[model samples]
Target chain A: SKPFTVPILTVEEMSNSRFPIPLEKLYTGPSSAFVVQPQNGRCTTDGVLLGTTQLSAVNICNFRGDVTRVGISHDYTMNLVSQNWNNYDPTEEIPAPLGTPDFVGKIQGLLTQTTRADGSTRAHKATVSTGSVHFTPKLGSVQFTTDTNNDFQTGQNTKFTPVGVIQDGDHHQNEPQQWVLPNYSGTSGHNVHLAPAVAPTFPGEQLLFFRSTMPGCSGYPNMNLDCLLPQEWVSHFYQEAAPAQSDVALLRFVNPDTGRVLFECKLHKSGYITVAHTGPYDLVIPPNGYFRFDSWVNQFYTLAPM
Target chain B: KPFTVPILTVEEMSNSRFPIPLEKLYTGPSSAFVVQPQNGRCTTDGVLLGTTQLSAVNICNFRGDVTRVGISHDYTMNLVSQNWNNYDPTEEIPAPLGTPDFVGKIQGLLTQTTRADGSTRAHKATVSTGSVHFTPKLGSVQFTTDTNNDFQTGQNTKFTPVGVIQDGHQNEPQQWVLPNYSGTSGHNVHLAPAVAPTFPGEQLLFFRSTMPGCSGYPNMNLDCLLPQEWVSHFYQEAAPAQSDVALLRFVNPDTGRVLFECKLHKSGYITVAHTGPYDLVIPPNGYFRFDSWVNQFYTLAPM
Candidate 1:
């Protein structure tokens, strides 16, 4: 079976262009490939398919620090379980494929200022080198915690600092880009934050990769990060209300390669139906109906015969 | 009080044949009196009469020989005694001594026995007050009253009922014909005393745990699934289309709060906002009737 072809665009072209149809219209005719409109909190660019493939995974995000490998099974369910990154050894070199020149050395310098013998002042940090990694297929949020002890007091033994550029790494070398980082001199011991960008990429099976976004401090040395996916998505499929349909009895989202049904919707006599699926899927409408893309949910629907 | 016949021996009392004492004539209105060993009393007038054995006797209300009247007839008495056996008008006192064991309406003298503490006091007989009785002879105990009795069973009490009655009137009472236990039973069985419809062509259908909320939003005009169990009970064929509007009330049984009340069409589908562990009450409407037979077994499937 042939892989479904989608248009690929460079980061520059993705950010500058728009889909042919206006997003405000929120409806579209059938097409083989289309661009996703750019949004504030979401990562979207023209000509870049909304769907993710194995080949496109590498350029999604860059991380420096302790790498936590997330093994996602064929089940596309999101599991937001916390991962500990406090046992980092600065002596070891950053692994290949994700390692860069001077990335580890710069991280070590930031940690030495906050380290102590008792592991009290040890700090762990994660740096995103380029564009934010948006896990689109799975729905859930990621959380970061630096405080092992629940005390809210400042100047505690351990601390966590998450640093990221506010803009996707599109700025020129001379241009200034705003960065989000914690003030190391502050007395705050524990900082907990949610990273909405990390998510699942495939269905049924794959290893999920998670990078610690916490900078450990010696006073409150415990660092943990977690990703939460619905249990339904993890084991099987999540259930949802079927999108409204007309002149159609059944709608299936089938994988073109494996010929497996990713999702399905069946209308009832009373004009109501429920659907269950693992992730967003390509729309397969009946011959009598045409697909209309709904931008609000990134899904498709069809109208009844007049 | 007037003197009555003396009864002796259990055999004589059970046979309703009492030995007539000399000079005591068995002539008077054919009234019945309780005959117990040691001491027997009249249920009508509470006149204490001596008896040798235990059994009931119809003293004057019998015929045959002068000594043998007739088989003793059961009588239920609601005795209202004045200040006897520590009687308090506000509290219910046990039936007086010699009261017959039977259930049903009965009229007789209200008398009280001596207190358990052995305090003997004078009790004045009063006019008959309407009363119902229950006894071991009836297999189980039951009470019926003309006016509201407001009787409440204990919390842990479970009534294994044989049948139910919807008493529309004393003359024309409606009864629910329950199937034999060997057969299937209807779901959501509610047995209530018969109440006449307030208006003509009025009926009621109880919908329990109807799925709450509408499926479509923005276009909030869609109807909800009419609980299949409820629909099966009231409708013979497929559920009728949305037609006449009926008053629909969603009520919480625990708090008796009517969570939502609105008019809905008879489309067999419902429209409401509240998710309910509630009772959806559909009062009588000229369009629907409580005429569906409920003798079949039903299993409620998940919505």
Candidate 2:
């Protein structure tokens, strides 16, 4: 082999005098090296070369966070979930603490890092932060509580079944129902609407609403989900756009990542599913987080406590 | 006056191979032979080392011939630019986001001609608006597209790509443009960047990681080779020429995609006037070739 080696141009001295060149020119091009007028010294690209434009800064869209399409759930510490909710009448209209959050966990971005078959990496970004959960509950202002209590019912009557446990993160798909919250005002055919008081609020602050499906009714007794929530509310929990139905859950729209409910809201076929509040069941009564009244139960009488 | 005399002559060490060409070898002294022209390699006075002749004047031309020596050292080449032309004059300046740009645009307003033939081919160029077209073999890369308007998304398809020097545009929208190829645009339906974004404020390339074959060859052991080094072959394979402009591209190693692009003008100097990814420039009558060896990197020289 003819070993013809070139001279190693060792720079004797150099000033920080740089040859000015705009780096943004490469922003639109495919990958390749561009020439740089070195200060003319001993220079070689000796280390790892990566993109200077941070992925976070890309303002990227169409990027997804979770494929489950079940928007992110704010994780609560076990210690906090064990702490019982202070039995108070939400209907009492007295200033009540919205219950202290153990730790505020939010699924802000919908993103994923996928490695292509050839080892290249492509990332997806979300359009909205998880916290952008905007919508009023079908029941504008209602009693928002866990299984042990219900302000809408008389006293702290535990009407709703206990929420499923998150053992080993086995999220029972049977839990957490979906709701198609189309702005009824937008399209009456789909017949969806938001009450005037139910303004768009943060995910944690949004009033939690639920629906009952009797055993013999259709779309009732869903095999999955801890509880049967208002199918309308389901539209907001996931990132999926509301065509009045079905889209991928893009951000963390719900809290307690799993087991949000555990009851079958078996509604009579011709019953529920009308415009907000005007339905037979009470719409927003647990006014303040204190008093309680037996609202409606067993698809029948409004049982007033003895 | 007691004038004290010191040892002026020095002895020459045999180990130090002084490459003083026969013509440059000045047997007699006219200038003080102090330092060796080839750094510490060889000395004209080393022949007279340990002698008063070492201090005596010794002049040598050394005619730029490199009679090799054992020289090895660690080095790093950072990317920066030489000649990137700006085509758009009224281009809006991009404000830095998050933090100040460690390396940013400094628009040096200047009027430049796009073509050497000197017709109506003149365009407005701002030194700052364009990207720094760094030399391929010495620059790092990542891929990015430019919008006709500003740093925004969902804009129309006015996006132009900075293709590799020889790695041109391909047919499929996602068909991988191999490391070395020709034509910047890779589509029968549409075209890749066949011309440099020679407008004011238009500049640059981007890359995240390495790709297959010709570049970052796996287990090939040349892991440290610069992206330009691996992809330089495209310049020759794509659009072979002796006097046109040339370009080289670098890819983001993590993503196996192109990120940055650099080009050479007709004078074989890095310029912003490149057409296809594989377009190349050779010195007037002289041409350059990038040769490679087993397990070793490519060697570039004039032919």
Of the true interface contacts, the fraction found in model 1 is 0.00
For each candidate, report its DockQ versus the true two-chain complex. 0.01, 0.01
Best by lDDT: 1
Compose the digit string of candidate 2's lDDT tens values, residues A1-306: 211111111111100111001111100111113111111111111111111100110111111111222223321101111012233332322111111110111111112122223322211111121111221111121111111111111111111111111111233222112121222112222222111112112211111122221111001112111111121111111111112111111111111224232111212111111111211222322111111111223323221211
True contacts kept of each: 0.00, 0.00
Runs with alpha carbons beyond 4 Å of true place in candidate 1 = A1-306, B1-242, B250-254, B266-303
**TM-scores for candidates 1 onward, in order:** 0.15, 0.15
| lDDT digits (tens) for residues B1-303 of candidate 2 | 111111111011000111110001011111222111111111111111110111000110000001111221111112122212122212221110000111211110111111222111101111111133311121222212211122111111110110111112111112121111111322111111122223332222211121111111111100100112112112212333333334333233445444334443322222222222332221112212221111112121211
Alpha-carbon local distance difference test for all models: 0.19, 0.17
What DockQ would you assign to candidate 2? 0.01
Query: Which tens-of-lDDT digit does each residue in B1-303 have in candidate 1?
Result: 121111111111111111111111011110132111111211111212221111111111110101101222222222222111122222221222222211112211111111222111111111111122232111122222211211111111111101112111222111122111111221111111121112222222222110101011111011112221122122212333233343444444445554444333332222233222333332221111121221112111111
RMSD of each: 36.9, 34.4
Error of 2 at A134 (Å): 10
